[PDB]
Amino acid sequence: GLEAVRKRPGMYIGSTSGEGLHHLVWEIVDNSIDEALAGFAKSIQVIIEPDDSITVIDDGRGIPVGIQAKTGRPAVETVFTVLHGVGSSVVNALSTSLDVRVYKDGKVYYQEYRRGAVVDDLKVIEETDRHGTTVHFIPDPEIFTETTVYDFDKLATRVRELAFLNRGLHISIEDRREGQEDKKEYHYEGLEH
Ligand SMILES: CCc1[nH]c2nc(Oc3cncnc3)nc(N3C[C@@H]4[C@@H](N)[C@@H]4C3)c2c1Cl
């Protein structure tokens, strides 16, 4: 299973250098983009947290949380724990920690993983009026031995390209790191222009 990803990350993310570090972001963001393509997500936020961890927030439908017949597990758990827009489990495997919050049907469903391994069963932690998925992950320095430090400009450049290629999408990139806080928001207009 996912243990293979931790032992041979080069086969799954191409490189364990800074390039691989940044690749993790796109492996999550691509799923939010897919949900925008499906017609449900309108806005995506990418956040570099103060500790070089990453948060991706969308306002789509939220990852399905119902038990699947084949696995006996919630769909969202399988997304992050089973090797397969199929890279979520790879990001999980290569992170010290990943937490997912699914905002759906007035409830917040929460699960966390540590180096790919489930901490506890999916749980409702809050009520909510919004919908969407929030994924937060801390890249594992055991994997990313060269660097775990994010390049804001590199991320922003691709975020801008993604906004353009997905005309109509609102997508932002934010840096919350000490002494360099910044935010750039992108939105290319559709027929309303
Ligand atoms: C914040 C990141 C995000 N947003 C996401 N938003 C959705 O939205 C839906 C909701 N309902 C059905 N399909 C996708 N799905 C997701 N997944 C379902 C399955 C894709 N192949 C994996 C990840 C995700 C993911 Cl991962």
Swiss-Prot record:
Disulfide bonds listed in the record: none
Location in or out of the cell: Cytoplasm
Purpose: DNA gyrase negatively supercoils closed circular double-stranded DNA in an ATP-dependent manner and also catalyzes the interconversion of other topological isomers of double-stranded DNA rings, including catenanes and knotted rings.
Family, similarity comment: Belongs to the type II topoisomerase family.
Assembly and interaction partners: Heterotetramer, composed of two GyrA and two GyrB chains. Within the heterotetramer, GyrA contains the active site tyrosine that forms a covalent intermediate with the DNA, while GyrB contributes the cofactor binding sites and catalyzes ATP hydrolysis.
Protein name: DNA gyrase subunit B
Portion of the full sequence shown: 18 to 224 of 642
